Amino acid sequence: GSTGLIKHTEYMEFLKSVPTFQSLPEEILSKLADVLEETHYENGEYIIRQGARGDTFFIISKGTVNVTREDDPVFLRTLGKGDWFGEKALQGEDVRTANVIAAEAVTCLVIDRDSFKHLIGGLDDVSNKAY
Ligand SMILES: Nc1nc(=O)c2nc(Sc3ccc(Cl)cc3)n([C@@H]3O[C@@H]4COP(=O)(O)O[C@H]4[C@H]3O)c2[nH]1
Ligand code: NA
């Protein structure tokens, strides 16, 4: 079978559609596409819980998510395809600072901390973004 190879190309083309990841050398995009895990959620499932230890980074390939924080939660924003989240816990303190909740059928491409630090950790787009 060639499914993994086809999927690998699909992941690389998807990463290239996201401005954050365009600066990355082809070899890094290829390794990122190797190590990410495609993960599926349905409406209402918490992808990230505020207060938890965090060790994963997420890129949305399908659907939308809601980002909330505890106050009756405070609604912060909604993200969709090509957006990413979960970087704050991967620098300095490792605590998740908000909830991220699937708002419909969602697919995320997920990478662990070590892969993140090795392949992405130092994009100013990721680590020194203001919001
Ligand atoms: N505290 C907090 N307040 C927000 O207003 C907010 N908005 C988002 S989405 C977003 C992601 C990237 C950019 Cl450039 C812009 C918006 N997030 C994300 O939720 C995650 C929970 O897990 P974490 O590890 O604390 O990282 C966190 C962030 O990625 C926010 N977190
Ligand atoms: Na942190």
From Swiss-Prot:
Outcome recorded upon mutating residue 77 to A: Reduces cGMP binding affinity
Subcellular location: Cytoplasm
Impact reported for residue 76 to A: Reduces cGMP binding affinity
Record note on modification: Autophosphorylation increases kinase activity.
Ligand binding (3',5'-cyclic AMP 2): 86-89, 96-97, 131
Residue sites binding 3',5'-cyclic GMP 2 per the record: 77, 86-89, 96-97, 131
Tissue: Primarily expressed in lung and placenta.
Region annotation (cGMP-binding, low affinity) ranges: 20-131
Transmembrane regions: none
Disease (UniProt): Aortic aneurysm, familial thoracic 8: A disease characterized by permanent dilation of the thoracic aorta usually due to degenerative changes in the aortic wall. It is primarily associated with a characteristic histologic appearance known as 'medial necrosis' or 'Erdheim cystic medial necrosis' in which there is degeneration and fragmentation of elastic fibers, loss of smooth muscle cells, and an accumulation of basophilic ground substance.
Function: Serine/threonine protein kinase that acts as a key mediator of the nitric oxide (NO)/cGMP signaling pathway. GMP binding activates PRKG1, which phosphorylates serines and threonines on many cellular proteins. Numerous protein targets for PRKG1 phosphorylation are implicated in modulating cellular calcium, but the contribution of each of these targets may vary substantially among cell types.
Assembly behavior: Isoform alpha: parallel homodimer or heterodimer and also heterotetramer. Interacts directly with PPP1R12A. Non-covalent dimer of dimer of PRKG1-PRKG1 and PPP1R12A-PPP1R12A. This interaction targets PRKG1 to stress fibers to mediate smooth muscle cell relaxation and vasodilation in responses to rises in cGMP. Isoform beta: antiparallel homodimer. Part of cGMP kinase signaling complex at least composed of ACTA2/alpha-actin, CNN1/calponin H1, PLN/phospholamban, PRKG1 and ITPR1. Interacts with IRAG1. Forms a stable complex with ITPR1, IRAG1, and isoform beta of PRKG1.
Family per similarity comment: Belongs to the protein kinase superfamily. AGC Ser/Thr protein kinase family. cGMP subfamily.
Domain notes per entry: Composed of an N-terminal leucine-zipper domain followed by an autoinhibitory domain, which mediate homodimer formation and inhibit kinase activity, respectively. Next, two cGMP-binding domains are followed by the catalytic domain at the C-terminus. Binding of cGMP to cGMP-binding domains results in a conformational change that activates kinase activity by removing the autoinhibitory domain from the catalytic cleft leaving the catalytic domain free to phosphorylate downstream substrates.
Further facts: The 3D structures in complex with cGMP and cAMP describe the hydrogen bonding interactions that modulate high selectivity for cGMP in the CNB-B domain, and reveal that all these contacts are disrupted in the structure with cAMP, explaining the low affinity of the enzyme for cAMP and the fact that cAMP can only weakly activate PKG.
Name of the featured protein: cGMP-dependent protein kinase 1
Organism of derivation: Homo sapiens (Human)
